[PDB]
Write an enzyme that holds these catalytic residues in place. Sequence first.
Site, short mmCIF file in Angstrom:
data_model
loop_
_atom_site.label_atom_id
_atom_site.label_comp_id
_atom_site.label_asym_id
_atom_site.label_seq_id
_atom_site.Cartn_x
_atom_site.Cartn_y
_atom_site.Cartn_z
N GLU A 91 0.73 -1.27 0.00
CA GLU A 91 0.00 0.00 0.00
C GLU A 91 0.76 1.32 0.00
O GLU A 91 1.77 1.48 0.67
CB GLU A 91 -0.96 -0.01 1.19
CG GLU A 91 -1.89 1.19 1.32
CD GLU A 91 -2.97 0.95 2.36
OE1 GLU A 91 -3.46 -0.20 2.45
OE2 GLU A 91 -3.36 1.91 3.06
N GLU A 97 -5.52 6.97 -0.09
CA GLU A 97 -5.93 7.72 1.10
C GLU A 97 -5.58 9.20 1.08
O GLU A 97 -6.28 10.00 1.70
CB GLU A 97 -5.38 7.06 2.37
CG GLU A 97 -3.91 7.19 2.61
CD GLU A 97 -3.46 6.28 3.73
OE1 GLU A 97 -3.63 5.05 3.57
OE2 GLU A 97 -2.96 6.78 4.75
N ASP A 143 -9.98 8.19 2.06
CA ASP A 143 -10.44 8.31 3.44
C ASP A 143 -11.69 9.16 3.23
O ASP A 143 -11.61 10.22 2.61
CB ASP A 143 -9.42 9.05 4.31
CG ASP A 143 -9.90 9.22 5.75
OD1 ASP A 143 -10.87 9.96 5.98
OD2 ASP A 143 -9.29 8.60 6.66
N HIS A 199 -9.95 4.24 3.74
CA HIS A 199 -8.97 4.30 4.81
C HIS A 199 -9.71 4.64 6.10
O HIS A 199 -10.39 5.67 6.17
CB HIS A 199 -7.92 5.37 4.47
CG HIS A 199 -7.02 5.73 5.60
ND1 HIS A 199 -7.36 6.66 6.56
CD2 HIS A 199 -5.76 5.32 5.91
CE1 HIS A 199 -6.36 6.81 7.41
NE2 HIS A 199 -5.38 6.01 7.03
#
Lengths: 402, 402
Positions: free
Chosen positions: B249, B277, B299, B326
């Site tokens: 990631e 994210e 996110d 996220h």
Amino acid sequence: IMTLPKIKHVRAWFIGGATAEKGAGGGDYHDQGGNHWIDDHIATPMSKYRDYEQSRQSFGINVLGTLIVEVEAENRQTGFAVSTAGEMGCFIVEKHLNRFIEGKCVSDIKLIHDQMLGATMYYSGSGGLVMNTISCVDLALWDLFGKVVGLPVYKLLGGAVRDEIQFYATGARPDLAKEMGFIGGKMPTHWGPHDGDAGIRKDAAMVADMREKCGPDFWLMLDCWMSQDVNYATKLAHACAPFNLKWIEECLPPQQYEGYRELKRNAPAGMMVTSGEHHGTLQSFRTLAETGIDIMQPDVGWCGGLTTLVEIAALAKSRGQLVVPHGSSVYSHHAVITFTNTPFSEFLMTSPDCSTLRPQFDPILLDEPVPVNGRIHKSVLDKPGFGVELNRDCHLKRPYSH
Amino acid sequence: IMTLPKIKHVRAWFIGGATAEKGAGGGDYHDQGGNHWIDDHIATPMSKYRDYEQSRQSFGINVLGTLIVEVEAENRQTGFAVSTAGEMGCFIVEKHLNRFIEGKCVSDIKLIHDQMLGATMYYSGSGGLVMNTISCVDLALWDLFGKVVGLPVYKLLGGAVRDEIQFYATGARPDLAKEMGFIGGKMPTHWGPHDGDAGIRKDAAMVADMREKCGPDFWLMLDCWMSQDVNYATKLAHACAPFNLKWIEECLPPQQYEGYRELKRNAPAGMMVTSGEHHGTLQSFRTLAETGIDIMQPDVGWCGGLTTLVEIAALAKSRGQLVVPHGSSVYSHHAVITFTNTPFSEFLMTSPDCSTLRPQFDPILLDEPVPVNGRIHKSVLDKPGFGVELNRDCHLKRPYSH
Ligand SMILES: [Mg+2]
Ligand SMILES: [Mg+2]
């Protein structure tokens, strides 16, 4: 060997913005008063809304105001710079970035720049507010370093490659700009996609009118401030081709790289497509450059600073592209006068009716030079750092301390 | 026909951050105290500097703190949301965004969202701080709307497509997460490019150890928090292949789209490459999606909000890609439980030693749901809006008013 002092303190102030006096001018080009051409029905991503069509100020293009960053060396010498960020910019400088600045050698500019980028990566969004603040710090550092060494920034960078900077003027009166000696005039579009063919007709007519008044060799350009889509921009570009529009600028929001690639491909033969004033970080410009647009236009105080600008110039030069920064006064002058691929520069009219040469960052910069007969001789820049002083008569506010 | 009230007020508060109590937790996942796994020698774009290698807090990952936005309807009902932005976030909400929010119908969510995006395009950088703020407002609006209507957000969106959400846990103890019922464990890398082969061996050994302790079917993943480059990331991926690492990631900074494309092409057969994210705006995700990475991980409180998240989900679904947000707690749960392409979710350990199920946004959210044996049944989400209340006991600060 010359001895260099360490950086002792970094301070941030602001003027204008939502928490100070509206219309302060200075670093925020758009923090103006009423009856200003820069707020006169300019097309934007928001002008499609009736309540925000007539004025950019109404949607808040002026909420940030001016950020002022001053770095002081141990020997009491100071350097400073201004940009758009205001109070929030002060928070970032006084509560976060100061830790990478203070204690460093005045020559540790690139190190501080990398640390600022690395430390703010999680919330900088690679542009905008946070990057504007980083840029202001970067510029204040170059100013301090030059003032300590006793050399203009342009000489530290490798010297001028031309004896004077020639300018085109951005504003509503290309005809008045020609009389002033500028080499061209860039006008803002006033209509957008929602206005359809009528909008295209009106802005194209505006261009036709100025071409009639200015002659064939005086350049004419259109600034679209992220207000269009690919189809609309294509139609407007073709509608202006009969008048030899030199380029059509920032037709799309910054993230629309794919759209820029398509628009460039659709452009009339010989007409250039430009953008970049709202992009930030070297990597973003790598992506922007690969779309094939002709000229990248970073704002020195928004793209990451002088340190980043110089890298962008190299990127453009490696591809045969030109780099022509957005406004920026002395912060751009000292850099571009050393760039072989920046044959001309921009002077963004702060004069309400584009009839006078009011300084680019009036009134926050003392002794700020302005083009004379559309040019700025290199000798005018022969002063330590960026050659100007901070106008402390302005009502500077210090919202934060450390 | 249900009658809906107009929005009367919007207010912003903050806790934690550089101008409040350090380690307040809440919306800012990184505003923790000492001896927290989330700050234990985590690899970052700054860990190459000796002074910033051991702690992310040292370079300022905790300066923003928590932003809290609360929108109040004319009928006195309220909705709220939290995110990472703190004091500066309050400036944006109280001094700029309020103009698009107040006076609107509680149902005018997408309209307000477009206006916030359009009005801040010139300083938002398409991500980070400003986008976090916009996101928080968007979520507060959805919360308010759901509470006014008397329905959970997940039902307003079209209902759950699964009776329960299954989670993988992010933290230093995958072995303990397995005992807790999670389906997998994602560990942060501790070394970076500057550590070379030694760094790769160490993080790979860390994975190898957890594979031995957790068995073959329990997923294992590595989080690299923008700390690597293509070559290093490629070496690590191949070094972890023998242990069937499910995915690697955010190996690169967000602007490095081209780098992600190359990394995905270099990845071991079957191993996924993910990121997202730190990206913001739907257009950035379009570009990110085209790099070919397997999973985009916005996110909800940083990408632009729920309004944006739903669009990103459609984008990914159209391409067969997955969207696994996220953290985000309930702001994600209510959305993802309705996405066919979000087969599992993330629970980011806020427990200092990853030994307990301390709430994702502890303690700003009252009665915040947590995975029960690695899962959250839709019944837990059967409450109005996002189903939670604000913890007024926290020392909320109101820096701005209007
Ligand atoms: Mg422009
Ligand atoms: Mg992550």
